């Protein structure tokens, strides 16, 4: 296209300038001492843009300039640190740092002192075969330096002790407590036992590979945290073998022998001891979640990292008999065993003092214009109110947190509106970072790449993590595609320089899944929290489409919401149905965070009044609260204004009930008569709403099944029988029990001719496989569709003439009805959206009916399974958000579907008493609970049978066969005795579209990405599956199903 | 009443519950060997695991009945036994009590053998001396 | 444990012995050539599995309303009825009786140990079963 006039100044600085004006000098030429000005391409502008990034250091300072003529310029970019210029061009309260410095440090010297046992240096050079030690060393380390401290002791006795480096041989270790005794000493942490100080010090040395978990769930023991924590708590569930004994021995004795860990205690003892008001402060650290679990992270990090460094031999006694490790590539015993010790303290230290400079130091997104940018269009009008909304609380949030709920319609552009909200909220001169988590279990490319088009960046701004979810740290075939600044990353030492955690973390935006967030709070074990952790630490968070999840999912989003809060996090919902129930326990899960948070970190004693927003297509406002009642009131008031607006907004959309007539109830023969049945009412449903144009008709239809086995038996018999009379039925199956890439490819092509608008009928019809389908047929009916499982409600800008739903759920149907005419203006007023009068699960007979997905449980069941009783009559004219955000009162949970959504909704999120569990979601800000596992436990995360991960794999010899392979650790084993192929029988006038050939689109990836075709299939061609016996049937068109 | 919920979590048990009966099968009670008893903490503590993860992810088809019986019936033991409702894990007809029902059973399944309530007993003796340090505060 | 295999788990844990024998003695093993140890252990328990699973077919043990077991059952059904020669005669072929009891063993040792095994061991099984059920005595 054109030449544009371009100028770039730098404000770089050391070594960034250097690199700067060699790359610079190249492209453009310079013009001053810092300036360069040159015609360039858009092309060669995203070019030059990219190779800047890539090598950018954190001294790097260069803005670009649009001179669009002696008059006028505009800011086009800024890459590295926005500050160094003003509006355009050329002009710490860290309060507890030093506090968890010391006790990492601490914990760090003692964490691995228990590795010392005859046991744990005989497994060191075992050999094989191989088996578990019987107690854990962590468990051994704990009590170990509890018989140091010794019973009963102060805080001072045992750190005036161990300043005293006089000290001493050995004879503490009498009043060690063994656990190989037949009947048991009292746990470490009862009250007569280990002082506050040491018992954090405790907590972090045995929790540094696992939370502690125990059998005993009683809130009121969880109150007591960690006081019950005994040895069952901490892997020695590991029983028994009978030796409980080399694990209590130590010949040579332990790391006190060793001078120079000897020493560097006693420094970190003495610094405790001169630290004013530190000793007092002991039992306000041990319950304050901030203070621990950002220790644990500094303690597990630092363990990470120094355990994958060769041995020094400038650290600790040379002599040193007992080992820590050994050689991952080798198997020979090297890195002593002070030496590790000695090493870890030192990077807890480093990584310590590296924290605050985080902010900083970490790339952010600075003056972007996509976001600046007025709107010209009306029907995102709302994204400038909302804009200037997020601009007017900005400096209300910077010192109290902000809890926001982008509560627009299906269909508004609630994804650049995410983006302009949170990018109002971050400082204008340094810029901004966040996270866009999305409320599916897996996220493909093609949405991922759906984010950076919406919101006007590439790929050197944002970052995808691909993918579903499961010491490497962050899963292993989890991968992260980014292009910008890797280089000059501040924790770069601690993770890999160009590993999956440094990019997760380097990228200034994030895209991913709640699921990839999760572990921050939920991971029981390893180093899995560490990198969501950091990203909660310094970006914001986008929690988008949050309520298609599970309601059994919903106490770990809590705990999830709650750490946002707890880390200095801001935090945005993003969906149209968000119920009362869930707002509420959310805000008061942030709300509890932000209160612990604000105790290190800002002005000491400022009152917990958290910066709350709504945004819709009507308005958008901002108050501040403090407490949930208030809060409660304000959404309730938003909400009502809110309900008045959609009341009166024109219908797109009319429902109607279609009765199904079954058979057997057989799942084929029930199948092959819906299908049956579906032809009558597509034909129907294409007669009301097409598109003409030059004599031809083109419609477009969606058809929704709850589950994937139901669907694909449809699929199978749509397919059999042919169109109706006269008719062309193009079938496209989207689920998420596809390859990764295929599903990818799908979504590609279905968002590209899914794309609708007013007076398109010319467009709509050239476009290239319509053109095509149209040239290559007689007929002149023809009917595209789209046979989709719930993925198809959730990140997919679709724009149906019409949709035929199986009913799960209110959230859903509303979700589905925005996807018809969501493009488009005006209304004939038929009906276009048809509701199954009952769905799969009922019409098979199954009690609950609405489950898996749905809310009905055996405790909270329906009492009629008919929608014709379900819904209010009233609603089928006018589907909109109205059901969901407000709860009917009274409640009738056993007769509406959506009010069970409610009653459910309430007697989990902030109750005392929730279903099953019946331990209260609070118990995770209001008690120490998160010392152990008990919560994570208690209410699990994606509870169910465990999916396993699957990929057709191009033969490690020969790139032209295929083997369905499954992932197992770090490697893929043959499974083709798994998997049947299954040929398909076709009917007249039907055949498919929006599919996806294997082979060419593996070969296409492959190309896209650099990549070997067998690492391209290992990487982008997973499916989770849940784990049967005899394995599945496969075919292109349809995926993986069920083989019996 | 179904034993489904119980197969599940002892066809993953295979190792531990040959074990179990090997050792045991023809013993006498009163006079148990160090790895009878281990035999027997170890098949316990194994369908402890699997029943009590069963109950807590809610591992069930809440559409069948029989089974959502059975599941009921083990959640009402958990809930007895960890603290929520009540903390007597050793009662009569509570989790281990239960626990010792299956071992029982997978011998009667596999071996033909009846054993009974002095088998049951030795059983009790052994849970609450092996496993009452997991719920208990000294 | 799922809501998909339960008429082989049932049978599963009425095979212990010789499921933990399987198991144990395969633990460590080559597949391409096996101790007589071995082949005996994966001989015993595939026996006892055709035991179970004949039963389970003969005496109709199934809740015929519950669709998804009756599924798993009918599967089997179709199975042994293309291996007793009633509908045909081959019980050795790809998706029948002794590749289903196979599948069956894979997924035990999967469950309770968790090696790897797949396609090269299913051969190696079906390779034993051809051999040593050649002919029923
Ligand atoms: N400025 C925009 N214009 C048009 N579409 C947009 C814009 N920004 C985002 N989108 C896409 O359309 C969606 C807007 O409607 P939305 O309410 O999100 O639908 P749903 O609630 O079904 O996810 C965005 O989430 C995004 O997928
Ligand atoms: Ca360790
Ligand atoms: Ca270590």
Same mark, same amino acid.
């Given at each position: 296209?054109?030449?544009?006039?371009?100028?770039?100044?730098?404000?770089?600085?050391?070594?960034?300038?250097?690199?700067?004006?060699?790359?610079?000098?190249?492209?453009?030429?310079?013009?001053?001492?810092?300036?360069?000005?040159?015609?360039?391409?858009?092309?060669?502008?995203?070019?030059?843009?990219?190779?800047?990034?890539?090598?950018?250091?954190?001294?790097?300072?260069?803005?670009?300039?649009?001179?669009?003529?002696?008059?006028?310029?505009?800011?086009?970019?800024?890459?590295?640190?926005?500050?160094?210029?003003?509006?355009?061009?050329?002009?710490?309260?860290?309060?507890?740092?030093?506090?968890?410095?010391?006790?990492?440090?601490?914990?760090?010297?003692?964490?691995?002192?228990?590795?010392?046992?005859?046991?744990?240096?005989?497994?060191?050079?075992?050999?094989?075969?191989?088996?578990?030690?019987?107690?854990?060393?962590?468990?051994?380390?704990?009590?170990?330096?509890?018989?140091?401290?010794?019973?009963?002791?102060?805080?001072?006795?045992?750190?005036?002790?161990?300043?005293?480096?006089?000290?001493?041989?050995?004879?503490?270790?009498?009043?060690?407590?063994?656990?190989?005794?037949?009947?048991?000493?009292?746990?470490?942490?009862?009250?007569?036992?280990?002082?506050?100080?040491?018992?954090?010090?405790?907590?972090?040395?045995?929790?540094?590979?696992?939370?502690?978990?125990?059998?005993?769930?009683?809130?009121?023991?969880?109150?007591?945290?960690?006081?019950?924590?005994?040895?069952?708590?901490?892997?020695?569930?590991?029983?028994?073998?009978?030796?409980?004994?080399?694990?209590?021995?130590?010949?040579?004795?332990?790391?006190?022998?060793?001078?120079?860990?000897?020493?560097?205690?006693?420094?970190?003892?003495?610094?405790?001891?001169?630290?004013?008001?530190?000793?007092?402060?002991?039992?306000?650290?041990?319950?304050?979640?901030?203070?621990?679990?950002?220790?644990?992270?500094?303690?597990?990090?630092?363990?990470?990292?120094?355990?994958?460094?060769?041995?020094?031999?400038?650290?600790?006694?040379?002599?040193?008999?007992?080992?820590?490790?050994?050689?991952?590539?080798?198997?020979?015993?090297?890195?002593?065993?002070?030496?590790?010790?000695?090493?870890?303290?030192?990077?807890?230290?480093?990584?310590?003092?590296?924290?605050?400079?985080?902010?900083?130091?970490?790339?952010?997104?600075?003056?972007?214009?996509?976001?600046?940018?007025?709107?010209?269009?009306?029907?995102?009008?709302?994204?400038?109110?909302?804009?200037?909304?997020?601009?007017?609380?900005?400096?209300?949030?910077?010192?109290?947190?902000?809890?926001?709920?982008?509560?627009?319609?299906?269909?508004?552009?609630?994804?650049?509106?995410?983006?302009?909200?949170?990018?109002?909220?971050?400082?204008?001169?340094?810029?901004?970072?966040?996270?866009?988590?999305?409320?599916?279990?897996?996220?493909?490319?093609?949405?991922?790449?759906?984010?950076?088009?919406?919101?006007?960046?590439?790929?050197?701004?944002?970052?995808?993590?691909?993918?579903?979810?499961?010491?490497?740290?962050?899963?292993?075939?989890?991968?992260?595609?980014?292009?910008?600044?890797?280089?000059?990353?501040?924790?770069?030492?601690?993770?890999?320089?160009?590993?999956?955690?440094?990019?997760?973390?380097?990228?200034?935006?994030?895209?991913?899944?709640?699921?990839?967030?999760?572990?921050?709070?939920?991971?029981?074990?390893?180093?899995?929290?560490?990198?969501?952790?950091?990203?909660?630490?310094?970006?914001?968070?986008?929690?988008?489409?949050?309520?298609?999840?599970?309601?059994?999912?919903?106490?770990?989003?809590?705990?999830?919401?709650?750490?946002?809060?707890?880390?200095?996090?801001?935090?945005?919902?993003?969906?149209?149905?968000?119920?009362?129930?869930?707002?509420?326990?959310?805000?008061?899960?942030?709300?509890?965070?932000?209160?612990?948070?604000?105790?290190?970190?800002?002005?000491?004693?400022?009152?917990?009044?958290?910066?709350?927003?709504?945004?819709?297509?009507?308005?958008?406002?901002?108050?501040?609260?403090?407490?949930?009642?208030?809060?409660?009131?304000?959404?309730?008031?938003?909400?009502?204004?809110?309900?008045?607006?959609?009341?009166?907004?024109?219908?797109?959309?009319?429902?109607?009930?279609?009765?199904?007539?079954?058979?057997?109830?057989?799942?084929?023969?029930?199948?092959?008569?819906?299908?049956?049945?579906?032809?009558?009412?597509?034909?129907?449903?294409?007669?009301?709403?097409?598109?003409?144009?030059?004599?031809?008709?083109?419609?477009?239809?969606?058809?929704?099944?709850?589950?994937?086995?139901?669907?694909?038996?449809?699929?199978?018999?749509?397919?059999?029988?042919?169109?109706?009379?006269?008719?062309?039925?193009?079938?496209?199956?989207?689920?998420?029990?596809?390859?990764?890439?295929?599903?990818?490819?799908?979504?590609?092509?279905?968002?590209?001719?899914?794309?609708?608008?007013?007076?398109?009928?010319?467009?709509?019809?050239?476009?290239?496989?319509?053109?095509?389908?149209?040239?290559?047929?007689?007929?002149?009916?023809?009917?595209?569709?789209?046979?989709?499982?719930?993925?198809?409600?959730?990140?997919?800008?679709?724009?149906?003439?019409?949709?035929?739903?199986?009913?799960?759920?209110?959230?859903?149907?509303?979700?589905?009805?925005?996807?018809?005419?969501?493009?488009?203006?005006?209304?004939?007023?038929?009906?276009?959206?048809?509701?199954?009068?009952?769905?799969?699960?009922?019409?098979?007979?199954?009690?609950?009916?609405?489950?898996?997905?749905?809310?009905?449980?055996?405790?909270?069941?329906?009492?009629?399974?008919?929608?014709?009783?379900?819904?209010?009559?009233?609603?089928?004219?006018?589907?909109?958000?109205?059901?969901?955000?407000?709860?009917?009162?009274?409640?009738?949970?056993?007769?509406?579907?959506?009010?069970?959504?409610?009653?459910?909704?309430?007697?989990?999120?902030?109750?005392?008493?929730?279903?099953?569990?019946?331990?209260?979601?609070?118990?995770?800000?209001?008690?120490?609970?998160?010392?152990?596992?008990?919560?994570?436990?208690?209410?699990?995360?994606?509870?169910?049978?465990?999916?396993?991960?699957?990929?057709?794999?191009?033969?490690?010899?020969?790139?032209?066969?295929?083997?369905?392979?499954?992932?197992?650790?770090?490697?893929?084993?043959?499974?083709?005795?798994?998997?049947?192929?299954?040929?398909?029988?076709?009917?007249?006038?039907?055949?498919?579209?929006?599919?996806?050939?294997?082979?060419?689109?593996?070969?296409?990836?492959?190309?896209?990405?650099?990549?070997?075709?067998?690492?391209?299939?290992?990487?982008?061609?997973?499916?989770?599956?849940?784990?049967?016996?005899?394995?599945?049937?496969?075919?292109?068109?349809?995926?993986?199903?069920?083989?019996? | 009443?179904?034993? +489904?919920?119980?197969? &599940?979590? @002892?066809?993953? #048990?295979?190792? /531990?519950?040959? *074990?179990?009966?090997?050792? %045991? !099968?023809? $013993?006498?009670?009163?006079?148990?060997?160090?790895?009878?008893?281990?035999?027997?903490?170890?098949?316990?503590?194994?369908?402890?695991?699997?029943?009590?993860? +069963?109950?807590?992810? &809610?591992? @069930?088809?809440? #559409?069948?009945? /029989?089974?959502? *019986?059975?599941?009921?019936? %083990? !959640?009402? $033991?958990?809930?007895?036994?960890?603290?929520?409702?009540?903390?007597?894990?050793?009662?009569?007809?509570?989790?281990?009590?239960?626990?010792?029902?299956?071992?029982?059973?997978?011998?009667?399944?596999?071996?033909?053998?009846?054993?009974?309530?002095?088998?049951?007993?030795?059983?009790?003796?052994?849970?609450?001396?092996?496993?009452?340090?997991?719920?208990?505060?000294?």
């Amino acid at each position: 296209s054109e030449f544009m006039n371009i100028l770039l100044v730098s404000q770089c600085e050391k070594r960034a300038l250097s690199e700067t004006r060699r790359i610079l000098d190249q492209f453009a030429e310079r013009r001053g001492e810092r300036t360069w000005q040159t015609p360039i391409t858009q092309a060669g502008l995203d070019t030059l843009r990219r190779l800047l990034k890539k090598s950018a250091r954190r001294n790097t300072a260069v803005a670009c300039h649009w001179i669009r003529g002696r008059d006028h310029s505009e800011l086009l970019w800024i890459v590295g640190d926005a500050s160094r210029f003003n509006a355009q061009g050329a002009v710490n309260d860290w309060h507890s740092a030093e506090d968890i410095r010391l006790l990492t440090v601490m914990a760090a010297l003692f964490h691995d002192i228990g590795k010392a046992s005859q046991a744990f240096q005989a497994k060191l050079r075992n050999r094989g075969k191989p088996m578990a030690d019987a107690y854990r060393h962590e468990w051994v380390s704990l009590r170990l330096f509890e018989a140091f401290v010794g019973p009963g002791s102060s805080d001072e006795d045992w750190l005036r002790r161990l300043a005293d480096k006089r000290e001493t041989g050995d004879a503490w270790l009498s009043q060690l407590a063994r656990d190989d005794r037949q009947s048991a000493p009292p746990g470490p942490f009862q009250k007569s036992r280990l002082p506050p100080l040491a018992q954090a010090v405790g907590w972090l040395i045995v929790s540094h590979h696992r939370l502690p978990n125990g059998d005993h769930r009683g809130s009121a023991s969880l109150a007591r945290l960690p006081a019950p924590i005994q040895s069952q708590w901490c892997g020695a569930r590991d029983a028994d073998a009978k030796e409980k004994a080399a694990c209590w021995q130590f010949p040579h004795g332990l790391p006190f022998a060793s001078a120079h860990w000897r020493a560097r205690t006693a420094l970190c003892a003495q610094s405790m001891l001169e630290r004013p008001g530190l000793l007092a402060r002991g039992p306000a650290l041990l319950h304050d979640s901030y203070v621990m679990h950002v220790s644990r992270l500094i303690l597990m990090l630092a363990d990470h990292h120094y355990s994958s460094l060769p041995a020094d031999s400038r650290l600790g006694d040379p002599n040193f008999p007992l080992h820590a490790n050994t050689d991952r590539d080798s198997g020979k015993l090297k890195q002593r065993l002070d030496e590790h010790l000695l090493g870890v303290a030192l990077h807890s230290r480093k990584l310590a003092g590296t924290l605050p400079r985080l902010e900083r130091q970490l790339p952010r997104l600075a003056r972007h214009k996509g976001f600046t940018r007025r709107v010209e269009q009306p029907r995102f009008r709302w994204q400038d109110k909302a804009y200037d909304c997020a601009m007017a609380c900005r400096e209300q949030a910077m010192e109290h947190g902000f809890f926001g709920l982008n509560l627009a319609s299906t269909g508004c552009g609630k994804t650049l509106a995410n983006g302009r909200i949170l990018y109002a909220l971050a400082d204008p001169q340094r810029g901004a970072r966040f996270s866009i988590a999305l409320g599916l279990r897996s996220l493909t490319l093609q949405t991922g790449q759906a984010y950076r088009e919406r919101l006007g960046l590439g790929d050197d701004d944002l970052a995808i993590l691909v993918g579903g979810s499961a010491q490497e740290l962050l899963a292993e075939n989890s991968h992260v595609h980014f292009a910008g600044t890797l280089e000059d990353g501040p924790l770069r030492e601690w993770l890999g320089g160009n590993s999956a955690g440094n990019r997760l973390l380097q990228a200034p935006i994030l895209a991913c899944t709640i699921d990839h967030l999760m572990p921050a709070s939920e991971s029981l074990r390893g180093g899995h929290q560490i990198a969501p952790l950091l990203r909660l630490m310094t970006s914001d968070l986008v929690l988008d489409e949050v309520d298609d999840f599970d309601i059994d999912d919903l106490p770990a989003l809590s705990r999830l919401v709650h750490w946002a809060g707890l880390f200095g996090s801001r935090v945005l919902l993003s969906s149209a149905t968000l119920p009362p129930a869930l707002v509420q326990g959310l805000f008061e899960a942030y709300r509890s965070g932000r209160e612990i948070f604000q105790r290190h970190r800002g002005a000491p004693g400022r009152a917990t009044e958290i910066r709350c927003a709504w945004f819709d297509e009507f308005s958008s406002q901002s108050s501040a609260h403090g407490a949930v009642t208030s809060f409660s009131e304000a959404h309730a008031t938003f909400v009502a204004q809110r309900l008045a607006k959609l009341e009166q907004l024109p219908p797109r959309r009319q429902a109607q009930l279609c009765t199904v007539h079954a058979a057997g109830e057989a799942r084929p023969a029930l199948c092959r008569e819906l299908a049956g049945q579906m032809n009558t009412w597509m034909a129907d449903l294409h007669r009301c709403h097409h598109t003409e144009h030059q004599g031809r008709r083109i419609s477009f239809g969606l058809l929704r099944l709850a589950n994937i086995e139901p669907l694909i038996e449809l699929a199978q018999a749509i397919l059999a029988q042919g169109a109706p009379e006269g008719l062309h039925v193009h079938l496209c199956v989207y689920h998420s029990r596809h390859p990764l890439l295929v599903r990818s490819a799908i979504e590609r092509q279905l968002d590209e001719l899914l794309k609708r608008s007013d007076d398109d009928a010319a467009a709509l019809f050239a476009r290239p496989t319509l053109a095509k389908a149209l040239q290559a047929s007689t007929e002149r009916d023809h009917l595209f569709v789209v046979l989709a499982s719930p993925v198809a409600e959730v990140g997919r800008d679709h724009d149906y003439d019409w949709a035929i739903v199986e009913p799960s759920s209110m959230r859903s149907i509303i979700q589905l009805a925005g996807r018809i005419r969501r493009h488009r203006s005006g209304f004939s007023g038929e009906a276009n959206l048809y509701l199954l009068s009952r769905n799969i699960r009922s019409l098979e007979g199954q009690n609950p009916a609405f489950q898996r997905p749905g809310f009905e449980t055996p405790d909270f069941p329906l009492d009629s399974h008919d929608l014709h009783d379900l819904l209010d009559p009233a609603l089928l004219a006018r589907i909109d958000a109205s059901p969901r955000i407000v709860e009917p009162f009274p409640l009738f949970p056993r007769s509406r579907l959506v009010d069970l959504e409610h009653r459910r909704l309430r007697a989990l999120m902030l109750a005392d008493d929730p279903p099953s569990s019946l331990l209260g979601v609070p118990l995770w800000w209001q008690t120490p609970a998160s010392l152990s596992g008990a919560l994570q436990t208690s209410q699990p995360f994606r509870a169910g049978a465990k999916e396993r991960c699957y990929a057709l794999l191009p033969d490690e010899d020969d790139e032209e066969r295929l083997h369905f392979s499954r992932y197992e650790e770090g490697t893929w084993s043959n499974q083709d005795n798994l998997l049947r192929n299954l040929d398909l029988t076709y009917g007249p006038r039907i055949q498919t579209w929006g599919t996806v050939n294997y082979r060419e689109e593996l070969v296409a990836m492959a190309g896209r990405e650099d990549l070997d075709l067998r690492q391209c299939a290992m990487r982008y061609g997973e499916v989770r599956l849940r784990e049967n016996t005899q394995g599945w049937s496969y075919h292109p068109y349809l995926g993986f199903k069920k083989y019996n | 009443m179904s034993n +489904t919920i119980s197969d &599940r979590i @002892v066809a993953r #048990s295979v190792i /531990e519950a040959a *074990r179990f009966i090997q050792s %045991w !099968e023809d $013993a006498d009670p009163d006079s148990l060997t160090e790895d009878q008893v281990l035999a027997a903490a170890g098949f316990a503590a194994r369908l402890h695991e699997g029943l009590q993860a +069963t109950v807590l992810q &809610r591992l @069930v088809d809440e #559409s069948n009945h /029989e089974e959502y *019986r059975e599941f009921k019936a %083990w !959640e009402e $033991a958990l809930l007895n036994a960890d603290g929520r409702v009540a903390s007597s894990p050793f009662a009569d007809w509570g989790w281990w009590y239960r626990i010792a029902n299956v071992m029982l059973a997978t011998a009667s399944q596999n071996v033909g053998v009846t054993w009974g309530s002095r088998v049951h007993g030795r059983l009790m003796a052994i849970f609450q001396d092996k496993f009452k340090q997991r719920y208990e505060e000294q």
